[PDB]
Amino acid sequence: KKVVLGKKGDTVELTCTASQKKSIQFHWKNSNQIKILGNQGSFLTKGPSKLNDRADSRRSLWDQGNFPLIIKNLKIEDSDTYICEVEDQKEEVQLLV
Amino acid sequence: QVQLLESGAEVKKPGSSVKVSCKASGDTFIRYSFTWVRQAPGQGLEWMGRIITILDVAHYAPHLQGRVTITADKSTSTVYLELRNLRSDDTAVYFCAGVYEGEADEGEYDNNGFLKHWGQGTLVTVT
Amino acid sequence: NNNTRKSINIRQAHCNISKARWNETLGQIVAKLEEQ
Amino acid sequence: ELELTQSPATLSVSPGERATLSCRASESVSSDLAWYQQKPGQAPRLLIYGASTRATGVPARFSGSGSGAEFTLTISSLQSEDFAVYYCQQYNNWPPRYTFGQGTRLEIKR
Amino acid sequence: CNTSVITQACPKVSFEPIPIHYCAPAGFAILKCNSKTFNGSGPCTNVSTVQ
Amino acid sequence: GEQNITLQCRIKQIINMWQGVGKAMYAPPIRGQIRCSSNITGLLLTRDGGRD
Amino acid sequence: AVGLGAFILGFLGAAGSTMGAASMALTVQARLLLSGIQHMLQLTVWGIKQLQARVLAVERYLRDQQLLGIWGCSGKIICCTNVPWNDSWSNKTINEIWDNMTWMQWEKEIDNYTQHIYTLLEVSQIQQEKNEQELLE
Ligand SMILES: *[C@@H]1O[C@H](CO)[C@@H](O[C@@H]2O[C@H](CO)[C@@H](O[C@@H]3O[C@H](CO)[C@@H](O)[C@H](O[C@H]4O[C@H](CO)[C@@H](O)[C@H](O)[C@@H]4O[C@H]4O[C@H](CO)[C@@H](O)[C@H](O)[C@@H]4O)[C@@H]3O)[C@H](O)[C@H]2NC(C)=O)[C@H](O)[C@H]1NC(C)=O
Ligand SMILES: *[C@@H]1O[C@H](CO)[C@@H](O[C@@H]2O[C@H](CO)[C@@H](O[C@@H]3O[C@H](CO)[C@@H](O)[C@H](O)[C@@H]3O)[C@H](O)[C@H]2NC(C)=O)[C@H](O)[C@H]1NC(C)=O
Ligand SMILES: CCCCCCCCCCCCO[C@@H]1O[C@H](CO)[C@@H](O[C@H]2O[C@H](CO)[C@@H](O)[C@H](O)[C@H]2O)[C@H](O)[C@H]1O
Ligand SMILES: *[C@@H]1O[C@H](CO)[C@@H](O[C@@H]2O[C@H](CO)[C@@H](O)[C@H](O)[C@H]2NC(C)=O)[C@H](O)[C@H]1NC(C)=O
Ligand SMILES: *[C@@H]1O[C@H](CO)[C@@H](O[C@@H]2O[C@H](CO)[C@@H](O)[C@H](O)[C@H]2NC(C)=O)[C@H](O)[C@H]1NC(C)=O
Ligand SMILES: *[C@@H]1O[C@H](CO)[C@@H](O[C@@H]2O[C@H](CO)[C@@H](O)[C@H](O)[C@H]2NC(C)=O)[C@H](O)[C@H]1NC(C)=O
Ligand SMILES: *[C@@H]1O[C@H](CO)[C@@H](O[C@@H]2O[C@H](CO)[C@@H](O)[C@H](O)[C@H]2NC(C)=O)[C@H](O)[C@H]1NC(C)=O
Ligand SMILES: *[C@@H]1O[C@H](CO)[C@@H](O)[C@H](O)[C@H]1NC(C)=O
Ligand SMILES: *[C@@H]1O[C@H](CO)[C@@H](O)[C@H](O)[C@H]1NC(C)=O
Ligand SMILES: *[C@@H]1O[C@H](CO)[C@@H](O)[C@H](O)[C@H]1NC(C)=O
Ligand SMILES: *[C@@H]1O[C@H](CO)[C@@H](O)[C@H](O)[C@H]1NC(C)=O
């Protein structure tokens, strides 16, 4: 896994990517398969997660094949494995705080 | 519910630019649209332009399109005007004005030009 | 056509859904979800 | 831009009389004008919102209406407090290219 | 990532949908699944051809 | 006994576009009556799953 | 006929029939055919669309009838060649294929070999032409 370490109170950008640049559906889930963020059409949605008031995404980059998850105000409780689902492929990044 | 506070007076040599600003206070910055007016001596309330704070866009009177920029700093509730290539024709008292947009934050913006909130006037001259 | 404006409304509307049909509809959806 | 022409400035109206002010647009306005009161050293306060709505804090004395390119403003029981220049502004412009006229000043005959 | 902005008029217009039929061009045909229980990805055992 | 579920609706002028990423502003609402009569014919649902 | 299969170029039979059954049905229909035994704009528009579909099918038909000459099968609906089946392409017998399978199933059974087979057919035709011209001397 890619491993990214942040610190309590910081902001971390975790990313998923694609070879195709535009009109790509993606989702971010945690290790317990709970949705955090995702792309429906052109809209950003949130899942039933502990991160709904902290997680965000830079919508302008979605058409660049870059689908970031940004967690603002990190806590130790956020350390986890974050799973990207983009198109058909999956990616995993571990976040430590 | 907004009070507009103008900045200090300026005197500039022709060809220079002047930065004029207004601090908006007493309510949410984003719910107010702002305009600038040029009260040149002996003239009426010449309109210079308007800025929309949700969609950060601005529109300007045609003769100033290559001369005036209207911007804002959302973190300091401040409206800014920069006018370049100054001439003595631009001697005026400059000021901000604005309107309340109902629940603009939630996408209910009205887009009114009927100005209710006005600053006291910033005098800009040339030398 | 009976709206006013608010400032300091017109942007106010409502939708009516038959209660009986909606609840019956969910009961049928639920039966299929229950099978799954 | 669309020009706005008013009646001659310096309308001598005695206090207590009803003043009549007006504004002509070069093009039609869909009840999208506004009236403002300017005094020396003061902000040009909004008096009438759209062709006829009184702006906040505006007394019953100050009112008007109109349509198309022809609008009228009157002041009932004119007060010494009302001797100011009244400006006409047009908003039916998109992209914005809003305009103002020159306005008419009221005067006390001497 | 800058912004591109277009300013233009907003006339109000009447707006109500018309059902649109899609039709195959010459050389092509459309197969239609007539099963009443078709789930979207299985085989269909009752198939008809339409334009 | 009311037999009517009512939803509260708002008309917005600044919306997110469905055809691409971006925002757009539309002119303010019509002053007369607006009436829509529609058939709900289907639902779009998603699931909340997970290990817990 | 020509409407078999519910489409032009579906000539040899109904979709869903077995290959064998379709051939027999075709023969019967051929014998019968030879024995010989309200106005709106949209009518114009669709009349043109229908003609375009029919004209195109004819042009494609004629083109293919000449292109097939490359394998020695020009001007034919049913040809016959001198290329052996080679077994590995399909392990089924003549009766198993013709009696139980339909045409789509058959194409699915061998579509990993048709580009190979097409190449073999061309090669055989070239050799046949060469041999005939050598004999004519
Ligand atoms: C599902 O299908 C159904 C039907 O199959 C769709 O329902 C239709 O929705 C439209 C949308 O409003 C509605 O159309 C109105 O019908 C009224 C009947 O007379 C018309 O008067 C009205 O026209 C006025 O309003 C328009 C609003 O944009 C104006 O553009 C138009 O110029 C008219 O405006 C004048 O009058 C109004 C009156 O208040 C005034 O305010 C204006 O200033 C102006 O003077 C529309 O035509 C249909 O009647 C509906 N059909 C039925 C049977 O009710 C339904 O929308 C579909 N669902 C979805 C989600 O699309
Ligand atoms: C649930 O909501 C529906 C709205 O979709 C209610 O139906 C409406 O009830 C009103 C009651 O007055 C009906 O008004 C009538 O209109 C006719 C029109 O000519 C008029 O002649 C009558 O005197 C009266 O005004 C209205 O028409 C009716 N809507 C429809 C489409 O029929 C319904 O009653 C609500 N349910 C309950 C239990 O309240
Ligand atoms: C766009 C429309 C174009 C018009 C399309 C017309 C299609 C109609 C097809 C009718 C087929 C009639 O039926 C079939 O014809 C072929 C014609 O070679 C016959 O086939 C006969 O000739 C061929 C070639 O000479 C031999 O390979 C075959 O061994 C022999 O039997 C079949 O024995 C008969 O059953
Ligand atoms: C939508 O439903 C509401 C009720 O849920 C309707 O409002 C009621 O209308 C009846 C009709 O006489 C009144 O007696 C009730 O007092 C109303 N209820 C309330 C809370 O005001 C409403 O009119 C319906 N909408 C439409 C378009 O008919
Ligand atoms: C929405 O409006 C329609 C009519 O435009 C309502 O349908 C009518 O409901 C009354 C109730 O008794 C029936 O008598 C009518 O015959 C119905 N009309 C038609 C054409 O079927 C409909 O019920 C309304 N929706 C809701 C939720 O009240
Ligand atoms: C396959 O689907 C077709 C299309 O619905 C069915 O045929 C229809 O049957 C109804 C019964 O009244 C007729 O009114 C239609 O005209 C028929 N349509 C056509 C195109 O023929 C058909 O029965 C279905 N077959 C099976 C096995 O379910
Ligand atoms: C639609 O129904 C078909 C069956 O008719 C489903 O396909 C089967 O899925 C199971 C899952 O393990 C397989 O074992 C079967 O072999 C499949 N059958 C066939 C014929 O493919 C299909 O998944 C259903 N699709 C949806 C969208 O629910
Ligand atoms: C809703 O479905 C019924 C079923 O016949 C149909 O008659 C009605 O017109 C439909 N309503 C709309 C808005 O399409
Ligand atoms: C379909 O199967 C039935 C079973 O008797 C048969 O009669 C019918 O002809 C078949 N259709 C085709 C296209 O073979
Ligand atoms: C076809 O027959 C030739 C004859 O030698 C053989 O070598 C070849 O492998 C056969 N094709 C396949 C796919 O086995
Ligand atoms: C081909 O058919 C024969 C018939 O007995 C069988 O033994 C053989 O295994 C078949 N080949 C394959 C690949 O199934």
Coordinates of N, CA and C in Angstrom, one line a residue, chain B:
Chain B
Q1 N -28.0 44.9 6.0 CA -27.7 45.2 7.4 C -26.2 45.6 7.5
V2 N -25.7 45.7 6.3 CA -24.3 46.0 6.1 C -23.9 47.5 6.0
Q3 N -22.8 47.8 6.7 CA -22.2 49.0 6.8 C -21.0 49.0 5.9
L4 N -20.8 50.0 5.0 CA -19.6 50.0 4.2 C -18.7 51.1 4.6
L5 N -17.4 50.7 4.8 CA -16.4 51.6 5.2 C -15.4 51.8 4.2
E6 N -15.3 53.0 3.7 CA -14.3 53.4 2.6 C -12.9 53.5 3.2
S7 N -12.0 53.4 2.3 CA -10.6 53.6 2.7 C -10.2 55.1 2.6
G8 N -8.9 55.3 2.6 CA -8.4 56.7 2.6 C -8.4 57.3 1.2
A9 N -8.2 58.6 1.1 CA -8.1 59.4 -0.1 C -6.7 59.2 -0.8
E10 N -6.7 59.4 -2.1 CA -5.5 59.2 -2.9 C -5.3 60.3 -3.9
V11 N -4.0 60.6 -4.2 CA -3.7 61.5 -5.3 C -2.6 60.8 -6.2
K12 N -2.9 60.6 -7.5 CA -2.0 59.9 -8.3 C -1.5 60.7 -9.6
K13 N -0.3 60.5 -10.0 CA 0.1 61.0 -11.3 C -0.7 60.3 -12.4
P14 N -1.1 60.9 -13.5 CA -1.7 60.2 -14.6 C -0.9 59.1 -15.1
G15 N -1.5 58.0 -15.5 CA -0.9 56.8 -16.0 C -0.8 55.7 -14.9
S16 N -0.8 56.2 -13.6 CA -0.7 55.2 -12.5 C -2.1 54.6 -12.2
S17 N -2.1 53.6 -11.3 CA -3.3 53.0 -10.9 C -3.6 53.3 -9.5
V18 N -4.9 53.2 -9.1 CA -5.3 53.5 -7.7 C -6.1 52.3 -7.2
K19 N -5.7 51.8 -6.0 CA -6.4 50.8 -5.4 C -7.3 51.3 -4.3
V20 N -8.6 51.1 -4.4 CA -9.6 51.7 -3.5 C -10.4 50.5 -2.9
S21 N -10.6 50.5 -1.6 CA -11.3 49.4 -1.1 C -12.4 49.8 -0.1
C22 N -13.3 48.9 0.2 CA -14.4 49.0 1.1 C -14.5 47.8 2.1
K23 N -14.6 48.1 3.3 CA -14.8 47.0 4.2 C -16.3 46.8 4.5
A24 N -16.8 45.7 4.3 CA -18.2 45.4 4.6 C -18.4 44.8 5.9
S25 N -19.3 45.3 6.8 CA -19.4 44.6 8.0 C -20.9 44.6 8.6
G26 N -21.1 43.7 9.5 CA -22.4 43.6 10.1 C -23.3 42.4 9.6
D27 N -22.9 41.8 8.5 CA -23.6 40.7 8.0 C -22.7 39.8 7.1
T28 N -23.2 38.7 6.6 CA -22.4 37.8 5.8 C -22.0 38.5 4.5
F29 N -20.7 38.5 4.2 CA -20.2 39.1 3.0 C -20.8 38.6 1.7
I30 N -20.9 37.3 1.7 CA -21.3 36.5 0.5 C -22.8 36.8 0.1
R31 N -23.6 37.3 1.0 CA -24.9 37.6 0.7 C -25.1 39.0 0.1
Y32 N -24.0 39.7 -0.1 CA -24.2 41.0 -0.7 C -23.5 41.2 -2.0
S33 N -24.1 41.8 -2.9 CA -23.5 42.1 -4.2 C -23.0 43.5 -4.1
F34 N -21.9 43.8 -4.8 CA -21.4 45.1 -4.7 C -21.1 45.8 -6.0
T35 N -21.3 47.1 -6.0 CA -21.0 47.9 -7.1 C -20.1 49.1 -6.8
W36 N -19.5 49.6 -7.8 CA -18.8 50.9 -7.6 C -19.3 52.0 -8.5
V37 N -19.3 53.2 -7.9 CA -19.8 54.4 -8.4 C -18.7 55.5 -8.4
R38 N -18.6 56.3 -9.5 CA -17.7 57.4 -9.6 C -18.3 58.7 -9.6
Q39 N -18.3 59.4 -8.5 CA -18.9 60.8 -8.4 C -17.9 61.8 -8.8
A40 N -17.7 62.0 -10.1 CA -16.8 63.0 -10.7 C -17.4 64.3 -10.4
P41 N -16.6 65.4 -10.0 CA -17.2 66.7 -9.7 C -18.0 67.2 -10.9
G42 N -19.2 67.7 -10.6 CA -20.1 68.2 -11.7 C -20.9 67.2 -12.4
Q43 N -20.7 65.9 -12.1 CA -21.3 64.8 -12.8 C -22.3 64.1 -12.0
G44 N -23.0 63.1 -12.6 CA -23.9 62.2 -11.8 C -23.2 61.0 -11.3
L45 N -24.0 60.0 -10.9 CA -23.5 58.8 -10.3 C -23.0 57.8 -11.3
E46 N -21.9 58.1 -12.0 CA -21.4 57.2 -13.0 C -21.2 55.8 -12.5
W47 N -21.8 54.8 -13.1 CA -21.6 53.4 -12.7 C -20.4 52.8 -13.3
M48 N -19.5 52.2 -12.5 CA -18.3 51.6 -13.0 C -18.4 50.1 -13.3
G49 N -19.1 49.5 -12.4 CA -19.2 48.0 -12.5 C -19.8 47.3 -11.2
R50 N -20.0 46.0 -11.3 CA -20.6 45.2 -10.3 C -19.8 43.9 -10.1
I51 N -19.7 43.4 -8.9 CA -19.2 42.1 -8.5 C -20.1 41.2 -7.8
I52 N -20.2 40.0 -8.3 CA -21.0 38.9 -7.7 C -20.1 38.1 -6.8
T53 N -20.4 37.9 -5.6 CA -19.5 37.2 -4.6 C -19.7 35.7 -4.6
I54 N -20.7 35.1 -5.1 CA -20.8 33.6 -5.1 C -20.1 33.1 -6.3
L55 N -20.5 33.7 -7.4 CA -19.8 33.3 -8.7 C -18.9 34.5 -8.8
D56 N -17.7 34.3 -8.6 CA -16.8 35.4 -8.5 C -16.5 36.0 -9.9
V57 N -17.5 36.8 -10.3 CA -17.5 37.4 -11.6 C -17.7 38.9 -11.5
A58 N -17.4 39.6 -12.5 CA -17.7 41.0 -12.4 C -18.0 41.5 -13.8
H59 N -18.7 42.6 -13.9 CA -19.1 43.2 -15.1 C -18.8 44.7 -15.0
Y60 N -18.3 45.3 -16.1 CA -17.9 46.7 -16.1 C -18.5 47.5 -17.2
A61 N -18.7 48.8 -16.9 CA -19.2 49.7 -18.0 C -18.2 49.6 -19.1
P62 N -18.6 49.5 -20.4 CA -17.7 49.3 -21.6 C -16.5 50.2 -21.7
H63 N -16.6 51.5 -21.3 CA -15.4 52.3 -21.5 C -14.3 52.1 -20.5
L64 N -14.6 51.3 -19.5 CA -13.6 51.0 -18.5 C -13.2 49.5 -18.6
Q65 N -13.6 48.8 -19.6 CA -13.3 47.4 -19.5 C -11.8 47.1 -19.6
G66 N -11.0 47.9 -20.2 CA -9.6 47.7 -20.3 C -8.9 48.4 -19.1
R67 N -9.6 49.1 -18.3 CA -9.1 49.9 -17.2 C -9.5 49.5 -15.8
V68 N -10.6 48.9 -15.6 CA -11.0 48.6 -14.2 C -11.2 47.2 -13.9
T69 N -10.7 46.8 -12.7 CA -10.9 45.5 -12.1 C -11.6 45.6 -10.8
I70 N -12.6 44.8 -10.6 CA -13.3 44.7 -9.3 C -13.1 43.3 -8.8
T71 N -12.6 43.2 -7.6 CA -12.4 42.0 -6.9 C -12.8 42.0 -5.5
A72 N -12.6 40.9 -4.8 CA -12.9 40.9 -3.4 C -12.1 39.9 -2.6
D73 N -12.0 40.1 -1.3 CA -11.3 39.2 -0.4 C -12.3 38.7 0.6
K74 N -12.8 37.5 0.3 CA -13.8 36.8 1.1 C -13.5 36.6 2.6
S75 N -12.2 36.6 2.9 CA -11.8 36.4 4.3 C -11.8 37.6 5.1
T76 N -11.8 38.8 4.5 CA -11.7 40.1 5.2 C -12.9 41.0 4.9
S77 N -13.9 40.4 4.2 CA -15.1 41.0 3.8 C -14.8 42.3 3.1
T78 N -13.8 42.3 2.2 CA -13.4 43.5 1.6 C -13.5 43.5 0.1
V79 N -14.1 44.6 -0.4 CA -14.3 44.8 -1.8 C -13.2 45.7 -2.4
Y80 N -12.6 45.3 -3.5 CA -11.5 46.1 -4.0 C -11.8 46.6 -5.4
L81 N -11.3 47.8 -5.7 CA -11.3 48.4 -7.0 C -9.9 48.8 -7.5
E82 N -9.5 48.4 -8.6 CA -8.3 48.9 -9.1 C -8.5 49.5 -10.5
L83 N -8.2 50.8 -10.5 CA -8.4 51.5 -11.8 C -7.1 52.0 -12.3
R84 N -6.8 51.6 -13.5 CA -5.5 51.9 -14.1 C -5.5 52.9 -15.2
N85 N -4.4 53.4 -15.6 CA -4.2 54.4 -16.6 C -5.0 55.7 -16.3
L86 N -4.8 56.2 -15.0 CA -5.6 57.3 -14.6 C -5.3 58.6 -15.3
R87 N -6.4 59.3 -15.5 CA -6.5 60.6 -16.2 C -7.1 61.6 -15.2
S88 N -7.0 62.9 -15.5 CA -7.7 63.9 -14.7 C -9.2 63.8 -14.7
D89 N -9.7 63.1 -15.8 CA -11.1 62.9 -16.0 C -11.7 61.9 -15.0
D90 N -10.8 61.2 -14.3 CA -11.2 60.2 -13.3 C -11.2 60.8 -11.9
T91 N -11.0 62.2 -11.8 CA -11.1 62.7 -10.5 C -12.5 62.5 -10.0
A92 N -12.7 61.9 -8.9 CA -14.0 61.6 -8.4 C -14.0 61.1 -7.0
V93 N -15.1 61.1 -6.4 CA -15.3 60.4 -5.2 C -15.8 59.0 -5.5
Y94 N -15.0 58.0 -5.1 CA -15.4 56.7 -5.5 C -16.0 56.0 -4.3
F95 N -16.9 55.1 -4.6 CA -17.5 54.4 -3.5 C -18.2 53.1 -3.8
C96 N -18.3 52.3 -2.8 CA -19.0 51.1 -2.8 C -20.4 51.2 -2.4
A97 N -21.2 50.3 -3.0 CA -22.5 50.2 -2.6 C -23.0 48.8 -2.8
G98 N -24.0 48.4 -2.1 CA -24.5 47.0 -2.4 C -25.9 46.7 -2.0
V99 N -26.3 45.4 -2.2 CA -27.6 44.9 -1.9 C -27.6 43.6 -1.2
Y100 N -28.7 43.3 -0.5 CA -28.9 42.0 0.1 C -29.6 41.0 -0.8
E101 N -28.9 39.8 -1.0 CA -29.4 38.8 -1.8 C -29.9 37.6 -0.9
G102 N -31.2 37.4 -1.0 CA -31.8 36.4 -0.1 C -31.3 35.1 -0.1
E103 N -30.7 34.6 1.0 CA -30.1 33.2 1.1 C -29.3 32.9 -0.1
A104 N -28.4 33.9 -0.5 CA -27.6 33.7 -1.6 C -26.6 32.5 -1.4
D105 N -26.3 32.2 -0.2 CA -25.4 31.1 0.2 C -25.9 29.8 -0.2
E106 N -27.2 29.6 -0.2 CA -27.9 28.4 -0.5 C -28.3 28.3 -2.0
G107 N -27.9 29.3 -2.8 CA -28.3 29.3 -4.2 C -29.6 30.1 -4.5
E108 N -30.1 30.9 -3.6 CA -31.3 31.7 -3.8 C -31.0 33.1 -4.3
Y109 N -29.8 33.4 -4.7 CA -29.4 34.8 -5.1 C -30.4 35.4 -6.1
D110 N -30.8 36.7 -5.8 CA -31.8 37.5 -6.5 C -31.2 38.4 -7.6
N111 N -30.0 38.7 -7.6 CA -29.2 39.5 -8.5 C -29.8 41.0 -8.7
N112 N -30.0 41.7 -7.6 CA -30.5 43.0 -7.6 C -29.5 44.1 -7.9
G113 N -29.9 45.2 -8.6 CA -29.0 46.3 -8.8 C -29.5 47.6 -8.0
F114 N -30.5 47.4 -7.2 CA -31.1 48.5 -6.4 C -30.3 48.7 -5.1
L115 N -29.4 49.7 -5.2 CA -28.4 49.8 -4.1 C -28.9 50.5 -2.8
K116 N -28.8 49.8 -1.7 CA -29.3 50.2 -0.4 C -28.2 50.6 0.5
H117 N -27.0 49.9 0.4 CA -26.0 50.2 1.4 C -24.9 50.9 0.7
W118 N -24.5 52.1 1.2 CA -23.5 52.9 0.5 C -22.4 53.4 1.5
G119 N -21.2 53.5 1.0 CA -20.1 54.0 1.8 C -20.1 55.5 1.8
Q120 N -19.2 56.1 2.5 CA -19.1 57.6 2.6 C -18.4 58.3 1.5
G121 N -17.7 57.6 0.7 CA -17.0 58.2 -0.5 C -15.5 58.4 -0.3
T122 N -14.7 57.9 -1.2 CA -13.2 58.0 -1.2 C -12.8 59.0 -2.3
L123 N -12.1 60.1 -1.9 CA -11.7 61.0 -2.9 C -10.4 60.6 -3.6
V124 N -10.4 60.5 -4.9 CA -9.2 60.2 -5.7 C -9.0 61.3 -6.7
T125 N -7.9 61.9 -6.7 CA -7.5 63.0 -7.6 C -6.2 62.7 -8.3
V126 N -5.8 63.6 -9.2 CA -4.5 63.3 -9.9 C -3.6 64.5 -9.7
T127 N -2.3 64.3 -10.0 CA -1.3 65.3 -9.9 C -0.1 65.2 -10.8

